[PDB]
RNA sequence: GGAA
RNA sequence: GGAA
């Protein structure tokens, strides 16, 4: 739920942008209304905006969160944005992809670039699977494939049958067959290492 | 709350109609009991009747309010009527629609018919969204669509993500799919103008 | 929140 | 479940 500190933060951001909805006035009100909010409250207000359908304003709270010190690239955080994005929206579709790009960049910008070893290894499987599954739902095939190819195939993050099953079905159901065949191959290799006899 | 002037106004209207409930005797008691009541008191008595379930009597206080000098077409005022209407009532369902018709007519009858420029532009988004959302709740799809098509699409009233989300889900959830697809299109166009990069 |  |  929302603390009275958060609910009022959302209220403010809306009353402010009520008069000016342009993108420059948005991040101005977002930064002002969600400026030094405790990690917990900021994160909540962000999801509260998503819930209400104010996606653009949620992205604003996302740019504010990035400028905070506790901000970390979270697969789940992004999954939310992907899920709460307007369907049948070419503009939004792009933002979703650009978002997925930001995530991977941020992730590999941390102690990566040559990390001993791996930004992606040790990543939360469940949360990562949620982002992927979410993208495959909105139909961002290419975008879903990039997270996989980067975190599982190149990133060396060990996932499970559930993850593969999601990607395999996803890619095959969104046209990317060469991709689907690869996922089935990775799984084949997975099942080879874990199956018994 | 109700002023002693209002509470007694409601009391009267009821005691009067108690003997005669017919529609002609209603507006007769409504006009008599709520005749020169201060804008504030009249409006309150109206909502008090709604609250009690006396919808027909609320409509009577609405016809009296229309004949007043301070009366203005208010999206919220109507939303109340739509909300307080008896569910599963074919008779009431019609009145709700006729009500929505009255609203748009009244709105465009003012300084409109060629206003430089727009009766609808500058309208209160929140209040307008409440009427729409209220109609979509009672399931008056066509009626909800008319307010949108007139105020947002033709009226040129600039709304937000929350408004679209309401209409998009509403139309799609009430059978009007062609309508829903259009709302998603308007939003797409909205998100194109306001999203970043 | 555009608020049993 | 990686959860109208």
mmCIF file of C-alpha atoms (C1' of nucleotides) in Angstrom:
data_model
loop_
_atom_site.group_PDB
_atom_site.id
_atom_site.type_symbol
_atom_site.label_atom_id
_atom_site.label_comp_id
_atom_site.label_asym_id
_atom_site.label_seq_id
_atom_site.Cartn_x
_atom_site.Cartn_y
_atom_site.Cartn_z
ATOM 1 C CA UNK A 1 0.000 0.000 0.000
ATOM 2 C CA UNK A 2 0.899 3.694 -0.191
ATOM 3 C CA UNK A 3 2.169 5.737 2.738
ATOM 4 C CA UNK A 4 0.485 9.092 3.232
ATOM 5 C CA UNK A 5 3.862 10.384 1.971
ATOM 6 C CA UNK A 6 3.480 8.561 -1.292
ATOM 7 C CA UNK A 7 -0.236 9.104 -1.942
ATOM 8 C CA UNK A 8 0.327 12.810 -1.559
ATOM 9 C CA UNK A 9 3.376 12.633 -3.798
ATOM 10 C CA UNK A 10 1.210 11.153 -6.581
ATOM 11 C CA UNK A 11 -1.539 13.650 -5.914
ATOM 12 C CA UNK A 12 0.931 16.500 -6.290
ATOM 13 C CA UNK A 13 2.599 15.282 -9.494
ATOM 14 C CA UNK A 14 -0.868 15.060 -11.077
ATOM 15 C CA UNK A 15 -2.177 18.438 -9.898
ATOM 16 C CA UNK A 16 1.053 19.979 -11.239
ATOM 17 C CA UNK A 17 1.040 18.310 -14.644
ATOM 18 C CA UNK A 18 -2.734 18.996 -14.780
ATOM 19 C CA UNK A 19 -1.969 22.475 -16.143
ATOM 20 C CA UNK A 20 1.054 21.434 -18.243
ATOM 21 C CA UNK A 21 1.251 17.961 -19.744
ATOM 22 C CA UNK A 22 4.218 18.507 -22.080
ATOM 23 C CA UNK A 23 7.251 16.202 -21.542
ATOM 24 C CA UNK A 24 9.512 19.023 -20.270
ATOM 25 C CA UNK A 25 6.984 20.084 -17.594
ATOM 26 C CA UNK A 26 6.438 16.452 -16.634
ATOM 27 C CA UNK A 27 9.957 15.510 -15.530
ATOM 28 C CA UNK A 28 9.961 18.915 -13.822
ATOM 29 C CA UNK A 29 6.968 18.066 -11.670
ATOM 30 C CA UNK A 30 8.088 14.432 -11.230
ATOM 31 C CA UNK A 31 11.480 15.517 -9.912
ATOM 32 C CA UNK A 32 9.793 18.136 -7.737
ATOM 33 C CA UNK A 33 7.035 15.838 -6.360
ATOM 34 C CA UNK A 34 9.201 12.699 -6.036
ATOM 35 C CA UNK A 35 12.530 14.380 -5.327
ATOM 36 C CA UNK A 36 13.896 12.944 -2.110
ATOM 37 C CA UNK A 37 11.281 10.325 -1.458
ATOM 38 C CA UNK A 38 12.474 7.289 0.479
ATOM 39 C CA UNK A 39 13.395 4.430 -1.876
ATOM 40 C CA UNK A 40 10.243 2.640 -0.718
ATOM 41 C CA UNK A 41 7.863 5.580 -1.298
ATOM 42 C CA UNK A 42 9.364 6.531 -4.635
ATOM 43 C CA UNK A 43 9.071 2.970 -5.916
ATOM 44 C CA UNK A 44 5.430 2.760 -4.707
ATOM 45 C CA UNK A 45 4.387 6.101 -6.261
ATOM 46 C CA UNK A 46 5.941 4.859 -9.473
ATOM 47 C CA UNK A 47 3.815 1.681 -9.509
ATOM 48 C CA UNK A 48 0.782 3.696 -8.399
ATOM 49 C CA UNK A 49 1.069 5.878 -11.485
ATOM 50 C CA UNK A 50 1.468 2.769 -13.634
ATOM 51 C CA UNK A 51 -1.668 1.312 -12.034
ATOM 52 C CA UNK A 52 -3.640 4.467 -12.864
ATOM 53 C CA UNK A 53 -2.551 4.364 -16.504
ATOM 54 C CA UNK A 54 -0.245 7.389 -16.226
ATOM 55 C CA UNK A 55 2.570 5.538 -17.989
ATOM 56 C CA UNK A 56 4.396 8.646 -19.188
ATOM 57 C CA UNK A 57 4.411 9.917 -15.610
ATOM 58 C CA UNK A 58 5.630 6.512 -14.422
ATOM 59 C CA UNK A 59 8.582 6.820 -16.835
ATOM 60 C CA UNK A 60 9.243 10.251 -15.296
ATOM 61 C CA UNK A 61 9.370 8.676 -11.811
ATOM 62 C CA UNK A 62 11.712 6.182 -13.441
ATOM 63 C CA UNK A 63 14.127 8.884 -14.593
ATOM 64 C CA UNK A 64 14.008 10.348 -11.111
ATOM 65 C CA UNK A 65 14.683 6.970 -9.565
ATOM 66 C CA UNK A 66 17.757 6.523 -11.841
ATOM 67 C CA UNK A 67 19.249 9.758 -10.484
ATOM 68 C CA UNK A 68 18.837 8.426 -6.929
ATOM 69 C CA UNK A 69 21.765 6.731 -5.127
ATOM 70 C CA UNK A 70 19.985 3.446 -4.275
ATOM 71 C CA UNK A 71 18.886 2.866 -7.858
ATOM 72 C CA UNK A 72 19.906 -0.496 -9.287
ATOM 73 C CA UNK A 73 18.953 -2.154 -12.608
ATOM 74 C CA UNK A 74 16.093 -4.434 -11.581
ATOM 75 C CA UNK A 75 14.503 -6.959 -14.047
ATOM 76 C CA UNK A 76 11.257 -6.804 -12.096
ATOM 77 C CA UNK A 77 11.120 -3.013 -11.971
ATOM 78 C CA UNK A 78 11.240 -2.982 -15.770
ATOM 79 C CA UNK A 79 8.784 -5.875 -16.120
ATOM 80 C CA UNK A 80 6.248 -3.578 -14.427
ATOM 81 C CA UNK A 81 6.730 -0.858 -17.042
ATOM 82 C CA UNK A 82 6.456 -3.393 -19.877
ATOM 83 C CA UNK A 83 3.263 -4.806 -18.369
ATOM 84 C CA UNK A 84 1.648 -1.476 -17.714
ATOM 85 C CA UNK A 85 2.371 -0.167 -21.203
ATOM 86 C CA UNK A 86 -0.589 0.789 -23.549
ATOM 87 C CA UNK A 87 -1.299 -1.972 -26.059
ATOM 88 C CA UNK A 88 -1.498 -1.249 -29.790
ATOM 89 C CA UNK A 89 0.742 1.763 -29.264
ATOM 90 C CA UNK A 90 3.610 2.134 -31.754
ATOM 91 C CA UNK A 91 5.018 5.000 -29.670
ATOM 92 C CA UNK A 92 4.868 2.905 -26.487
ATOM 93 C CA UNK A 93 6.202 -0.188 -28.277
ATOM 94 C CA UNK A 94 9.373 1.754 -29.059
ATOM 95 C CA UNK A 95 9.716 3.043 -25.477
ATOM 96 C CA UNK A 96 9.424 -0.569 -24.267
ATOM 97 C CA UNK A 97 12.326 -1.551 -26.472
ATOM 98 C CA UNK A 98 14.355 1.518 -25.566
ATOM 99 C CA UNK A 99 13.604 0.603 -21.960
ATOM 100 C CA UNK A 100 14.983 -2.907 -22.443
ATOM 101 C CA UNK A 101 18.059 -1.369 -24.008
ATOM 102 C CA UNK A 102 18.523 0.956 -21.018
ATOM 103 C CA UNK A 103 18.245 -2.017 -18.651
ATOM 104 C CA UNK A 104 20.977 -4.068 -20.314
ATOM 105 C CA UNK A 105 23.216 -1.034 -20.674
ATOM 106 C CA UNK A 106 22.766 -0.081 -16.996
ATOM 107 C CA UNK A 107 23.328 -3.669 -15.962
ATOM 108 C CA UNK A 108 26.570 -3.962 -17.920
ATOM 109 C CA UNK A 109 27.695 -0.445 -16.996
ATOM 110 C CA UNK A 110 27.986 -1.252 -13.287
ATOM 111 C CA UNK A 111 30.913 -3.427 -12.136
ATOM 112 C CA UNK A 112 30.920 -4.887 -15.669
ATOM 113 C CA UNK A 113 32.840 -4.092 -18.857
ATOM 114 C CA UNK A 114 35.172 -6.842 -17.634
ATOM 115 C CA UNK A 115 33.748 -8.022 -14.315
ATOM 116 C CA UNK A 116 35.265 -11.015 -12.543
ATOM 117 C CA UNK A 117 32.843 -12.185 -13.119
ATOM 118 C CA UNK A 118 29.516 -11.379 -14.768
ATOM 119 C CA UNK A 119 26.869 -8.835 -14.114
ATOM 120 C CA UNK A 120 24.309 -11.292 -15.296
ATOM 121 C CA UNK A 121 25.426 -14.329 -13.447
ATOM 122 C CA UNK A 122 23.661 -14.347 -10.082
ATOM 123 C CA UNK A 123 20.721 -12.385 -11.497
ATOM 124 C CA UNK A 124 17.269 -13.343 -10.188
ATOM 125 C CA UNK A 125 15.823 -15.991 -12.496
ATOM 126 C CA UNK A 126 12.220 -15.400 -11.473
ATOM 127 C CA UNK A 127 12.426 -11.624 -11.926
ATOM 128 C CA UNK A 128 14.320 -11.955 -15.200
ATOM 129 C CA UNK A 129 11.740 -14.488 -16.439
ATOM 130 C CA UNK A 130 8.987 -12.032 -15.589
ATOM 131 C CA UNK A 131 10.471 -9.276 -17.730
ATOM 132 C CA UNK A 132 10.949 -11.654 -20.650
ATOM 133 C CA UNK A 133 7.477 -13.189 -20.324
ATOM 134 C CA UNK A 134 6.036 -9.665 -19.998
ATOM 135 C CA UNK A 135 7.799 -8.562 -23.233
ATOM 136 C CA UNK A 136 6.662 -11.677 -25.077
ATOM 137 C CA UNK A 137 3.129 -10.780 -23.900
ATOM 138 C CA UNK A 138 3.242 -7.241 -25.311
ATOM 139 C CA UNK A 139 4.742 -8.929 -28.373
ATOM 140 C CA UNK A 140 8.225 -7.370 -28.201
ATOM 141 C CA UNK A 141 9.930 -10.477 -29.618
ATOM 142 C CA UNK A 142 13.210 -8.850 -30.613
ATOM 143 C CA UNK A 143 13.274 -7.103 -27.235
ATOM 144 C CA UNK A 144 12.611 -10.326 -25.354
ATOM 145 C CA UNK A 145 15.284 -12.072 -27.351
ATOM 146 C CA UNK A 146 17.858 -9.440 -26.449
ATOM 147 C CA UNK A 147 17.427 -9.941 -22.728
ATOM 148 C CA UNK A 148 17.809 -13.704 -23.167
ATOM 149 C CA UNK A 149 20.757 -13.546 -25.545
ATOM 150 C CA UNK A 150 22.495 -11.106 -23.219
ATOM 151 C CA UNK A 151 21.698 -12.543 -19.768
ATOM 152 C CA UNK A 152 21.402 -16.302 -20.464
ATOM 153 C CA UNK A 153 23.340 -17.025 -23.672
ATOM 154 C CA UNK A 154 26.188 -14.448 -23.322
ATOM 155 C CA UNK A 155 25.757 -13.311 -19.706
ATOM 156 C CA UNK A 156 26.098 -16.872 -18.463
ATOM 157 C CA UNK A 157 23.115 -16.580 -16.130
ATOM 158 C CA UNK A 158 21.820 -20.096 -15.314
ATOM 159 C CA UNK A 159 18.059 -20.312 -15.711
ATOM 160 C CA UNK A 160 15.590 -23.247 -15.636
ATOM 161 C CA UNK A 161 13.067 -25.226 -17.639
ATOM 162 C CA UNK A 162 10.366 -22.639 -16.953
ATOM 163 C CA UNK A 163 12.518 -19.899 -18.469
ATOM 164 C CA UNK A 164 13.280 -21.862 -21.637
ATOM 165 C CA UNK A 165 9.684 -22.936 -22.029
ATOM 166 C CA UNK A 166 8.664 -19.261 -21.873
ATOM 167 C CA UNK A 167 11.192 -18.159 -24.497
ATOM 168 C CA UNK A 168 10.776 -21.207 -26.732
ATOM 169 C CA UNK A 169 6.977 -20.716 -26.914
ATOM 170 C CA UNK A 170 7.349 -16.960 -27.037
ATOM 171 C CA UNK A 171 9.704 -16.782 -30.023
ATOM 172 C CA UNK A 172 7.870 -19.503 -31.887
ATOM 173 C CA UNK A 173 4.580 -17.681 -31.253
ATOM 174 C CA UNK A 174 5.902 -14.306 -32.435
ATOM 175 C CA UNK A 175 7.508 -15.289 -35.729
ATOM 176 C CA UNK A 176 11.134 -15.567 -34.631
ATOM 177 C CA UNK A 177 11.587 -19.265 -35.444
ATOM 178 C CA UNK A 178 15.362 -19.340 -35.824
ATOM 179 C CA UNK A 179 15.377 -17.900 -32.314
ATOM 180 C CA UNK A 180 12.914 -20.492 -31.012
ATOM 181 C CA UNK A 181 15.048 -23.299 -32.449
ATOM 182 C CA UNK A 182 18.029 -21.927 -30.541
ATOM 183 C CA UNK A 183 16.174 -21.774 -27.228
ATOM 184 C CA UNK A 184 15.096 -25.389 -27.720
ATOM 185 C CA UNK A 185 18.782 -26.155 -28.326
ATOM 186 C CA UNK A 186 19.888 -24.423 -25.094
ATOM 187 C CA UNK A 187 17.215 -26.371 -23.242
ATOM 188 C CA UNK A 188 18.367 -29.587 -24.932
ATOM 189 C CA UNK A 189 21.802 -28.848 -23.605
ATOM 190 C CA UNK A 190 20.242 -27.993 -20.228
ATOM 191 C CA UNK A 191 18.285 -31.208 -20.047
ATOM 192 C CA UNK A 192 21.392 -33.058 -20.978
ATOM 193 C CA UNK A 193 23.216 -31.773 -17.985
ATOM 194 C CA UNK A 194 20.392 -32.249 -15.512
ATOM 195 C CA UNK A 195 18.438 -35.231 -16.641
ATOM 196 C CA UNK A 196 19.241 -38.622 -15.134
ATOM 197 C CA UNK A 197 19.089 -42.099 -16.654
ATOM 198 C CA UNK B 1 -23.465 18.469 4.901
ATOM 199 C CA UNK B 2 -26.979 19.913 4.667
ATOM 200 C CA UNK B 3 -27.983 23.317 5.999
ATOM 201 C CA UNK B 4 -31.160 23.385 8.057
ATOM 202 C CA UNK B 5 -32.517 25.154 4.943
ATOM 203 C CA UNK B 6 -31.756 22.182 2.774
ATOM 204 C CA UNK B 7 -32.731 19.352 5.134
ATOM 205 C CA UNK B 8 -36.114 20.964 5.529
ATOM 206 C CA UNK B 9 -36.379 21.455 1.784
ATOM 207 C CA UNK B 10 -35.935 17.689 1.288
ATOM 208 C CA UNK B 11 -38.320 16.929 4.111
ATOM 209 C CA UNK B 12 -40.969 19.094 2.481
ATOM 210 C CA UNK B 13 -40.622 17.714 -1.055
ATOM 211 C CA UNK B 14 -41.121 14.214 0.387
ATOM 212 C CA UNK B 15 -44.094 15.013 2.631
ATOM 213 C CA UNK B 16 -45.722 16.692 -0.391
ATOM 214 C CA UNK B 17 -45.125 13.913 -2.902
ATOM 215 C CA UNK B 18 -46.090 11.434 -0.136
ATOM 216 C CA UNK B 19 -49.750 11.927 -1.086
ATOM 217 C CA UNK B 20 -49.152 12.271 -4.849
ATOM 218 C CA UNK B 21 -46.263 10.470 -6.511
ATOM 219 C CA UNK B 22 -47.251 11.028 -10.154
ATOM 220 C CA UNK B 23 -44.677 12.857 -12.351
ATOM 221 C CA UNK B 24 -46.835 16.002 -12.733
ATOM 222 C CA UNK B 25 -47.249 16.395 -8.944
ATOM 223 C CA UNK B 26 -43.544 15.735 -8.446
ATOM 224 C CA UNK B 27 -42.070 18.637 -10.418
ATOM 225 C CA UNK B 28 -44.819 20.699 -8.775
ATOM 226 C CA UNK B 29 -43.598 19.918 -5.281
ATOM 227 C CA UNK B 30 -39.922 20.033 -6.346
ATOM 228 C CA UNK B 31 -40.329 23.526 -7.781
ATOM 229 C CA UNK B 32 -42.314 24.553 -4.708
ATOM 230 C CA UNK B 33 -39.919 23.023 -2.119
ATOM 231 C CA UNK B 34 -36.675 23.898 -3.951
ATOM 232 C CA UNK B 35 -37.832 27.086 -5.658
ATOM 233 C CA UNK B 36 -35.426 29.845 -4.722
ATOM 234 C CA UNK B 37 -32.926 27.832 -2.768
ATOM 235 C CA UNK B 38 -29.379 29.178 -2.799
ATOM 236 C CA UNK B 39 -27.273 27.444 -5.468
ATOM 237 C CA UNK B 40 -25.455 25.628 -2.660
ATOM 238 C CA UNK B 41 -28.599 24.380 -0.873
ATOM 239 C CA UNK B 42 -30.371 23.361 -4.054
ATOM 240 C CA UNK B 43 -27.370 21.354 -5.224
ATOM 241 C CA UNK B 44 -27.079 19.653 -1.791
ATOM 242 C CA UNK B 45 -30.794 18.750 -1.569
ATOM 243 C CA UNK B 46 -30.434 17.281 -5.032
ATOM 244 C CA UNK B 47 -27.566 14.982 -3.977
ATOM 245 C CA UNK B 48 -29.382 14.207 -0.723
ATOM 246 C CA UNK B 49 -32.343 12.856 -2.667
ATOM 247 C CA UNK B 50 -29.975 10.844 -4.854
ATOM 248 C CA UNK B 51 -28.345 9.428 -1.715
ATOM 249 C CA UNK B 52 -31.738 8.342 -0.359
ATOM 250 C CA UNK B 53 -32.623 6.560 -3.598
ATOM 251 C CA UNK B 54 -35.262 9.107 -4.645
ATOM 252 C CA UNK B 55 -33.807 9.329 -8.152
ATOM 253 C CA UNK B 56 -36.990 10.559 -9.822
ATOM 254 C CA UNK B 57 -37.158 13.354 -7.257
ATOM 255 C CA UNK B 58 -33.476 14.109 -7.860
ATOM 256 C CA UNK B 59 -34.261 14.542 -11.579
ATOM 257 C CA UNK B 60 -37.037 16.941 -10.523
ATOM 258 C CA UNK B 61 -34.509 19.006 -8.526
ATOM 259 C CA UNK B 62 -32.437 18.829 -11.694
ATOM 260 C CA UNK B 63 -35.177 20.387 -13.823
ATOM 261 C CA UNK B 64 -35.566 23.074 -11.195
ATOM 262 C CA UNK B 65 -31.844 23.711 -11.160
ATOM 263 C CA UNK B 66 -31.861 24.125 -14.988
ATOM 264 C CA UNK B 67 -34.443 26.913 -14.690
ATOM 265 C CA UNK B 68 -32.166 28.722 -12.216
ATOM 266 C CA UNK B 69 -29.813 31.505 -13.403
ATOM 267 C CA UNK B 70 -26.560 30.022 -12.024
ATOM 268 C CA UNK B 71 -27.130 26.668 -13.699
ATOM 269 C CA UNK B 72 -24.266 25.505 -15.897
ATOM 270 C CA UNK B 73 -23.722 22.148 -17.665
ATOM 271 C CA UNK B 74 -21.453 20.313 -15.231
ATOM 272 C CA UNK B 75 -19.878 16.883 -16.092
ATOM 273 C CA UNK B 76 -19.691 16.055 -12.398
ATOM 274 C CA UNK B 77 -23.281 17.036 -11.650
ATOM 275 C CA UNK B 78 -24.409 14.522 -14.268
ATOM 276 C CA UNK B 79 -21.929 11.858 -13.139
ATOM 277 C CA UNK B 80 -23.808 11.893 -9.817
ATOM 278 C CA UNK B 81 -27.131 11.138 -11.508
ATOM 279 C CA UNK B 82 -25.559 8.347 -13.577
ATOM 280 C CA UNK B 83 -24.001 6.842 -10.451
ATOM 281 C CA UNK B 84 -27.103 7.061 -8.339
ATOM 282 C CA UNK B 85 -29.317 5.503 -11.000
ATOM 283 C CA UNK B 86 -31.126 2.132 -10.262
ATOM 284 C CA UNK B 87 -29.276 -0.791 -11.829
ATOM 285 C CA UNK B 88 -31.067 -3.295 -14.065
ATOM 286 C CA UNK B 89 -33.625 -0.627 -14.902
ATOM 287 C CA UNK B 90 -34.499 -0.287 -18.601
ATOM 288 C CA UNK B 91 -36.524 2.846 -17.811
ATOM 289 C CA UNK B 92 -33.608 4.380 -15.890
ATOM 290 C CA UNK B 93 -31.084 3.252 -18.519
ATOM 291 C CA UNK B 94 -32.936 5.379 -21.066
ATOM 292 C CA UNK B 95 -33.097 8.403 -18.734
ATOM 293 C CA UNK B 96 -29.319 8.092 -18.252
ATOM 294 C CA UNK B 97 -28.817 8.297 -21.988
ATOM 295 C CA UNK B 98 -31.334 11.098 -22.407
ATOM 296 C CA UNK B 99 -29.464 12.821 -19.589
ATOM 297 C CA UNK B 100 -26.157 12.512 -21.440
ATOM 298 C CA UNK B 101 -27.859 13.931 -24.501
ATOM 299 C CA UNK B 102 -29.172 16.902 -22.498
ATOM 300 C CA UNK B 103 -25.666 17.560 -21.159
ATOM 301 C CA UNK B 104 -23.998 17.743 -24.568
ATOM 302 C CA UNK B 105 -26.835 19.809 -25.991
ATOM 303 C CA UNK B 106 -26.704 22.273 -23.067
ATOM 304 C CA UNK B 107 -22.940 22.428 -23.321
ATOM 305 C CA UNK B 108 -22.998 23.213 -27.037
ATOM 306 C CA UNK B 109 -26.002 25.529 -26.718
ATOM 307 C CA UNK B 110 -24.130 28.059 -24.576
ATOM 308 C CA UNK B 111 -21.509 30.270 -26.268
ATOM 309 C CA UNK B 112 -21.146 27.472 -28.848
ATOM 310 C CA UNK B 113 -22.696 26.799 -32.257
ATOM 311 C CA UNK B 114 -19.548 28.505 -33.553
ATOM 312 C CA UNK B 115 -17.558 29.505 -30.475
ATOM 313 C CA UNK B 116 -14.077 30.970 -30.846
ATOM 314 C CA UNK B 117 -13.304 28.623 -29.637
ATOM 315 C CA UNK B 118 -14.792 25.442 -28.188
ATOM 316 C CA UNK B 119 -17.219 24.754 -25.442
ATOM 317 C CA UNK B 120 -15.404 21.563 -24.727
ATOM 318 C CA UNK B 121 -11.888 22.797 -24.761
ATOM 319 C CA UNK B 122 -11.016 23.899 -21.230
ATOM 320 C CA UNK B 123 -13.512 21.442 -19.737
ATOM 321 C CA UNK B 124 -12.465 19.744 -16.487
ATOM 322 C CA UNK B 125 -10.716 16.488 -17.365
ATOM 323 C CA UNK B 126 -11.241 14.894 -13.964
ATOM 324 C CA UNK B 127 -14.960 15.708 -13.855
ATOM 325 C CA UNK B 128 -15.462 14.666 -17.471
ATOM 326 C CA UNK B 129 -13.594 11.401 -16.792
ATOM 327 C CA UNK B 130 -15.886 10.753 -13.850
ATOM 328 C CA UNK B 131 -19.033 11.013 -15.951
ATOM 329 C CA UNK B 132 -17.581 8.717 -18.602
ATOM 330 C CA UNK B 133 -16.273 6.179 -16.079
ATOM 331 C CA UNK B 134 -19.643 6.343 -14.285
ATOM 332 C CA UNK B 135 -21.511 5.611 -17.566
ATOM 333 C CA UNK B 136 -19.159 2.762 -18.430
ATOM 334 C CA UNK B 137 -19.925 1.401 -14.932
ATOM 335 C CA UNK B 138 -23.704 1.434 -15.429
ATOM 336 C CA UNK B 139 -22.879 -0.085 -18.819
ATOM 337 C CA UNK B 140 -24.066 2.807 -21.013
ATOM 338 C CA UNK B 141 -21.393 2.184 -23.666
ATOM 339 C CA UNK B 142 -22.998 4.156 -26.481
ATOM 340 C CA UNK B 143 -23.675 6.970 -24.015
ATOM 341 C CA UNK B 144 -20.100 6.968 -22.756
ATOM 342 C CA UNK B 145 -18.825 6.961 -26.299
ATOM 343 C CA UNK B 146 -20.887 10.016 -27.184
ATOM 344 C CA UNK B 147 -19.355 12.143 -24.461
ATOM 345 C CA UNK B 148 -15.866 11.120 -25.593
ATOM 346 C CA UNK B 149 -16.498 11.535 -29.308
ATOM 347 C CA UNK B 150 -18.022 14.947 -28.661
ATOM 348 C CA UNK B 151 -15.703 16.397 -25.991
ATOM 349 C CA UNK B 152 -12.342 14.738 -26.799
ATOM 350 C CA UNK B 153 -12.448 13.667 -30.462
ATOM 351 C CA UNK B 154 -14.599 16.515 -31.923
ATOM 352 C CA UNK B 155 -14.660 18.998 -29.027
ATOM 353 C CA UNK B 156 -10.876 19.153 -28.977
ATOM 354 C CA UNK B 157 -10.690 18.800 -25.200
ATOM 355 C CA UNK B 158 -7.191 17.562 -24.233
ATOM 356 C CA UNK B 159 -7.372 14.677 -21.785
ATOM 357 C CA UNK B 160 -4.728 12.284 -20.369
ATOM 358 C CA UNK B 161 -3.606 8.680 -20.159
ATOM 359 C CA UNK B 162 -6.067 7.989 -17.345
ATOM 360 C CA UNK B 163 -8.968 9.127 -19.519
ATOM 361 C CA UNK B 164 -7.965 6.962 -22.482
ATOM 362 C CA UNK B 165 -7.313 3.968 -20.278
ATOM 363 C CA UNK B 166 -10.847 4.341 -18.883
ATOM 364 C CA UNK B 167 -12.481 4.548 -22.315
ATOM 365 C CA UNK B 168 -10.255 1.938 -23.955
ATOM 366 C CA UNK B 169 -11.050 -0.641 -21.231
ATOM 367 C CA UNK B 170 -14.642 0.508 -21.026
ATOM 368 C CA UNK B 171 -15.513 0.108 -24.710
ATOM 369 C CA UNK B 172 -13.594 -3.126 -25.020
ATOM 370 C CA UNK B 173 -15.383 -4.453 -21.925
ATOM 371 C CA UNK B 174 -18.851 -3.484 -23.175
ATOM 372 C CA UNK B 175 -18.759 -4.907 -26.692
ATOM 373 C CA UNK B 176 -17.913 -1.762 -28.646
ATOM 374 C CA UNK B 177 -14.590 -2.976 -30.071
ATOM 375 C CA UNK B 178 -14.357 -0.690 -33.090
ATOM 376 C CA UNK B 179 -14.706 2.102 -30.545
ATOM 377 C CA UNK B 180 -12.032 0.645 -28.265
ATOM 378 C CA UNK B 181 -9.620 0.378 -31.199
ATOM 379 C CA UNK B 182 -10.157 4.070 -31.898
ATOM 380 C CA UNK B 183 -9.471 5.119 -28.310
ATOM 381 C CA UNK B 184 -6.244 3.107 -28.390
ATOM 382 C CA UNK B 185 -5.424 4.997 -31.599
ATOM 383 C CA UNK B 186 -6.054 8.416 -29.992
ATOM 384 C CA UNK B 187 -3.849 7.361 -27.095
ATOM 385 C CA UNK B 188 -1.191 6.146 -29.543
ATOM 386 C CA UNK B 189 -1.262 9.583 -31.055
ATOM 387 C CA UNK B 190 -1.204 11.061 -27.535
ATOM 388 C CA UNK B 191 1.774 9.016 -26.464
ATOM 389 C CA UNK B 192 3.491 10.008 -29.629
ATOM 390 C CA UNK B 193 3.269 13.634 -28.772
ATOM 391 C CA UNK B 194 4.241 13.286 -25.132
ATOM 392 C CA UNK B 195 6.615 10.406 -24.903
ATOM 393 C CA UNK B 196 10.347 11.100 -24.989
ATOM 394 C CA UNK B 197 13.209 9.048 -26.409
ATOM 395 C "C1'" G C 1 -7.359 9.794 -6.974
ATOM 396 C "C1'" G C 2 -11.204 11.209 -11.852
ATOM 397 C "C1'" A C 3 -12.712 9.447 -3.781
ATOM 398 C "C1'" A C 4 -18.443 2.909 0.986
ATOM 399 C "C1'" G D 1 3.930 -19.392 -9.173
ATOM 400 C "C1'" G D 2 8.176 -16.082 -12.578
ATOM 401 C "C1'" A D 3 0.978 -13.902 -8.841
ATOM 402 C "C1'" A D 4 -7.358 -9.431 -11.813
#
